[PDB]
Amino acid sequence: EGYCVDLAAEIAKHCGFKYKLTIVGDGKYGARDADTKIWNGMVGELVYGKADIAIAPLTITLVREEVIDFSKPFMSLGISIMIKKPQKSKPGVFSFLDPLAYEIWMCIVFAYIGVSVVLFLVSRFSP
């Protein structure tokens, strides 16, 4: 059971033929050795006549087109990024200056010094 099982059921429904769900022996997808020039896996099963049709996630490449044929891709995909879910991490000392400002605290301190200097210049210049 799974996705490709129901996909093969839909193919047999819209095409009208008996099927036989078989398992590949070595568990390999498909490869051609440079020495033997022999395709293995389900590719070798289709080339050497061991199988009739393969309904499985096999990557359509150019080197596989040279021996067998491929239909239009039913499921498009690509390369994605697997990261973990961002949970809460311990912020620590950075929580003292975390909200509302990263640089404006120094502006508050500078305005504090400025208001202090102006208040001293007003309060200590009357004579």
Ligand X SMILES: O=c1[nH]c2cc(C(F)(F)F)c(N3CCOCC3)cc2n(CP(=O)(O)O)c1=O
Binding site for another protein (CB under 8 A): 3, 6-7, 10-11, 14-15, 42-43, 46-47, 53-62, 64-65, 67-88, 98-102, 104, 107
Closest CA to 43 of 30, 55, 33: 30
73 assigned to a ligand binding site = no
| Cα dihedral 75, 76, 82, 85 in deg (nearest 10) | -70
Q: Is 57 an interacting residue with respect to ligand X (CB under 6 A)?
A: yes
64 assigned to a ligand binding site = yes
CB of 31 to ligand X, least distance (A): 8
> For 5, how many CA atoms within 13 A lie in the half-sphere containing its CB?
5
Q: Is 58 an interacting residue with respect to ligand X (CB under 6 A)?
A: yes
Name the token pair of 1. Answer: 């059971």
CB of 44 to ligand X, least distance (A): 13
Q: Is 80 an interacting residue with respect to ligand X (CB under 6 A)?
A: no
Closest CA to 44 of 60, 28, 20: 28
Q: Is 29 an interacting residue with respect to ligand X (CB under 6 A)?
A: yes
Closest CA to 55 of 21, 86, 25: 21
Residue number with CB closer to ligand X (22 or 116): 22
Residues in contact with ligand X by the rule CB under 6 A: 29-30, 57-59
